[PDB]
Amino acid sequence: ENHSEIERRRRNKMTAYITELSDMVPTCSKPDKLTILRMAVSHMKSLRPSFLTDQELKHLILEAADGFLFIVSCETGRVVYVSDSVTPVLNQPQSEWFGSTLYDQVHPDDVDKLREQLSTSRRSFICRMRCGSPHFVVVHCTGYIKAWPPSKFCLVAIGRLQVPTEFISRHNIEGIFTFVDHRCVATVGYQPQELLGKNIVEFCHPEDQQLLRDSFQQVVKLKGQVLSVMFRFRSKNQEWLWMRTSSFTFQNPYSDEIEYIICTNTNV
């Protein structure tokens, strides 16, 4: 590329920068380049080493992560400090965390994991913690192990808050149940074991069997699209029930072969 073109590109870039700066500086809001630079120089002295202070950085981190800070000693898991953002997150006042131990605040099944994690520089795990006014939520913890006050070790971590008329069943390309959700017990009355291994047609009223077979042949060919069909189904109580089944093959994301047909049968 010719030198002149590169130089012209640089000139245009610099002019764009100057226009942006002129727009930004309150006093300018058109003077020449020199006056704009002087006004910006003077303006930047009415403000003000780091771009952002510590309080502002904390504000940004809380706006990005929706979490709280807590420090817990290694030996006894005793909370030594907890930010005031624990209240919005876990609806639990700071007084409920001070003096307690970390283990009291986590689900009983996570206690072993946490005791293994706090044992004695980074640390990262996933644990459930209790909500106040037991409801639990999944929180991802990130932090490190250090000496304190600035065995005398304490984990400084920041907890990030990680974000019926129908039942779902799968089928092979022949119609044999391979997975039946537990909602089948209420929806149609059969236990999940009662249906596994039996062709869906066997439960269909004789006159509408052909429609179901045609649908099962069509959906394997449509190869991705849905296909709804209504037919009568024999319930455990020998009562004929109208049901609607929306089906569409599932194709492996890499090989595009058919894994299984999933149907969402709904009681009408």
Partner: peptide, 15 residues
């Protein structure tokens, strides 16, 4: 204002 400086080091990643 004394524990604000721990937020950055207590993070696995950057803003």
């Amino acid at each position: 204002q004394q524990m604000d400086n721990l937020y950055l080091k207590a993070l696995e990643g950057f803003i």
